[PDB]
């Protein structure tokens, strides 16, 4: 029945819902809509999408993702989609050893969580306390859990998507 | 009572400002001059259009709105991200201002949050759900405007309006 209470969620839950709906699902639908995908003069019929959750929660995950992609020598790839007026931009491994197109992303939306955490702590000093680190790790775990639960509900995503932790 | 938990509109507005608004402003101010298809612009204005109604899929609503406004896609390169920015602009303007537009797709997430919050057992939106949706759209707009006030570029060149 009716519950007294205010609208309120973990930031990781809302950000993971958005990430699944507006990137994961459209990637899977694009790759399953085309009977075959071709990139850089090579054809791919099988795909894997790996979502890399950052090991530490930095406010700027765009920088962290750039560093991670550079370290792994992954390069940009553009995948067309009919669900959006601009294509999907992700990373892939041109050094793969199979006929599977291995795609990767580190969700930049995660960065926002850090801001939320700071407001929760009413931070008055420079530096991350072990309490802030604990809250960050808890949020990273919840983001991963929510994403995996959403992936389990979709046949496309369950077939081709995995979620791992950085390093 | 003292647990981490926020309005979805707050979280989504923070993400939208950091990972789109600010990077648009920074990319466009890096350029020594603004040019598209050989035309020169002396200013740019970025207009963020908040939806009138809260649909789960804001891309569809944005497509309808942009089609009504005869706005077309534009790709803006950026060094703040490993892929360029994609928004809409007015190719039929004649006044030397680069008119850029976006309807925040991230807003769609609010709908899901509200639906789970309502413990819905029937098809249809009660007036309480609609009131909550409108309140969340207002809070998204307010949070975005407060974030824009903290940046000289965004304060100067970004505006936030409601659809229609
Ligand atoms: N590697 C990669 N990741 C993607 C892509 N599309 C979405 N994502 C990821 O999914 C998250 C949610 O995207 P959104 O719901 O559309 O919510 C987006 C979206 O509403 C907007 N936004 C960001 N970039 C753009 C853009 O280039 N064009 C437009 N029209 N909106 C953008 O800002 C919001 C927040 O974006 P993020 O915090 O960065 O968070 C994004 C990002 O982590 C993609 O093409 N490539």
Author numbering:
A (entry chain B): 147 to 313
B (entry chain A): 150 to 313
Q: What's the publication's text?
A:
During phage infection, bacterial STING sense c-di-GMP generated by the CD-NTase (cGAS/DncV-like nucleotidyltransferase) encoded in the same operon and signal suicide commitment as a defense strategy that restricts phage propagation. The structure of MySTING was then solved by MR using the refined model of PcSTING. Here, our structures demonstrate that the symmetric recognition of single c-di-GMP by dimeric bacterial STING proteins is dictated by the guanidinium group of arginine residue (R233/R230 in PcSTING/MySTING) that recognizes the O6 and N7 atoms of guanine base, the backbone oxygen and amide group (H238/H235 in PcSTING/MySTING) that form three hydrogen bonds to the Watson-Crick edge of guanine base and the aspartate residue (D252/D251 in PcSTING/MySTING) that binds to the N2 atom of guanine base.
Although no nucleotide was included in the crystallization solution, the strong electron-density unambiguously identified the bound CDN as c-di-GMP. Therefore, it is clear that the four-layer stacking interaction mediated by the binding motif (Phe/Leu)/Gua/(Tyr/Phe)/Arg (e.g., F171/Gua/Y235/R233 in PcSTING or L169/Gua/Y232/R230 in MySTING), together with the arginine residue (R233/R230 in PcSTING/MySTING) that recognizes the Hoogsteen edge of the guanine base, and the aspartate residue (D252/D251 in PcSTING/MySTING) that contacts the N2 position of the guanine base contributes to the stringent specificity for c-di-GMP by bacterial STING proteins. Furthermore, changing c-di-GMP to c-di-AMP completely aborted the interaction with MySTING. A similar arrangement of dimers along the a axis of MySTING crystal suggests a common mode of dimer–dimer interaction.
